[PDB]
Design a binder for these strands. Structure first.
Lengths: 50, 85
DNA sequence: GGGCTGCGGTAGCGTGACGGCGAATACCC
DNA sequence: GGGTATTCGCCGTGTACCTCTCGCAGCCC
RNA sequence: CCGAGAGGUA
């Protein structure tokens, strides 16, 4: 086998949309808002801080 | 009149820009030196009441809008200013 | 001659399966 | 706030074999 | 010798 260095990280669609979502009920975050974060129309915060 | 992005068909940016120049739509694409600096992306300026986005989408040489969702993306005027290299 | 590529257009095409089940969500507390 | 209850959207829909045609045009780079 | 479409046998 070979591999492709994907220059951006990329979500596996099986663990995103298997019904139920594994990333969905792993993050406690709805599948719609995860698809809105992944497809570049909304942001999600990481370590909001003060 | 706010700035939109258009992904053109592959290798038809000249024809897409020609038809959008026959319409009253501003085009913007940096030429590097002569091939464009970007790929098939192109920046248009219009107003959706003057010329509608469906008429822009049905232009010879325009594949689609950069959408990200329902509505096509507004790019801010600081970006369009900072393509004046 | 050629790379590549998803329609060809200054829109709209789609349109005659049906059920089960589970999550997502709406309406009403 | 959570309890019904509707809607959405994914699943699935027999076996084996035989024959035939037809399978990229556009194309502006 | 892979896919699709049409037809047929049981």
């Amino acid at each position: 086998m070979g591999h492709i260095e994907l220059a951006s990280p990329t979500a596996h669609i099986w663990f995103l949309k298997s019904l139920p979502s594994r990333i969905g009920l792993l993050l406690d975050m709805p599948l719609r808002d995860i698809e809105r974060v992944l497809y570049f129309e909304s942001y999600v915060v990481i370590e909001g801080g003060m | 009149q706010s700035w939109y992005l258009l992904y053109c068909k592959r290798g038809q940016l000249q024809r897409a820009q020609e038809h959008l120049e026959r319409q009253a739509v501003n085009c913007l694409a940096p030429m590097i030196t002569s091939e464009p600096l970007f790929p098939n992306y192109l920046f248009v300026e219009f107003d959706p009441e003057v010329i509608h986005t469906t008429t822009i989408n049905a232009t010879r040489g325009v594949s689609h809008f950069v959408r990200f969702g329902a509505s096509p993306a507004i790019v801010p005027s600081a970006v369009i200013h900072q393509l004046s290299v």
